Amino acid sequence: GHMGNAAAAKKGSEQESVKEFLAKAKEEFLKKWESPTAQLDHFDRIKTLGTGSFGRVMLVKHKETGNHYAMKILDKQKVVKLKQIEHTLNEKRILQAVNFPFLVKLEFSFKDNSNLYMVMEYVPGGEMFSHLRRIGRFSEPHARFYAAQIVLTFEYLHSLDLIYRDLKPENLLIDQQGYIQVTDFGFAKRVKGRTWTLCGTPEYLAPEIILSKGYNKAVDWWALGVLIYEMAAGYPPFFADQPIQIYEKIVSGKVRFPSHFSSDLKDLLRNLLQVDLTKRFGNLKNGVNDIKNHKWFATTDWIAIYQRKVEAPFIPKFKGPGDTSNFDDYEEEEIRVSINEKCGKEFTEF
């Protein structure tokens, strides 16, 4: 076969150990999930780090401790549509319950008359997105190092019946050791089987989402294919100026690859970017192991990635606490808190 006796035995033992880890991880998650901490004037607001549908993420400094954090601010009155509301409650509840080396750590959450707030560990190395756009494309070893972290993170999340649903370089922060921290759980959801919301980012949507079919955690494995392609090419596989054109390319079942992609990479990507769910890697009887045991990952020491023992492709420059040099600049808008409580009943559980 492809493996000798000793290699095969090592892999099987490795798989029993994964099972053991995931069983303990589920016990720990469920305790926090069933039983889900600060105030706005406890922080100085420093700089906007990014902006989105409902608000912004700011660097903030905790006044008493001096620790820096990323604060996501959501304007309750912008969170108006039904699935925008439910998604915000998903995000907070999931973030407070998970624990994994490549997932950002939530430290505080609170609300006031106008806004919802989630305060997370600050990751100063910047978004994968801007490093990727600046350099053009990552080498295959570099892309593989980041991809391995996403594979392990999705194996963790999926074992908890969590779907992530917004993988993209914008959502992947690089920490001081050069490893990934996934942020933004605004589209994540606990799903036992299928779910039906039409949501995500156009370039990263699986065909079954676009086609209004009930879908499952395999949409994350499709998105991994898009991510790996974009990291290694510098642009995603379904690339057009308008969402409707992107959707048409996704559904077609066609993908073209740069001539510099290795054949191992193309093989992996054809099996992730697979429109037929009975054939998509991650979704078959051997689950995530079809991905982890693929030839493109043959040099990957999965346990060593998890333990953060592997040397990273690069280490972001950092000048000290609160350095924002690895982030782009955004227009600053003052945080106004109304004297009247807004949308109190829609956000009771937050």
């Binding site: 993209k168 995500g200 690339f239 969402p243 992107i246």
Partner: peptide
Amino acid sequence: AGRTGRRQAIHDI
């Protein structure tokens, strides 16, 4: 030709 800037996720297409 395609989108090169940051991409917004859509909560309800």
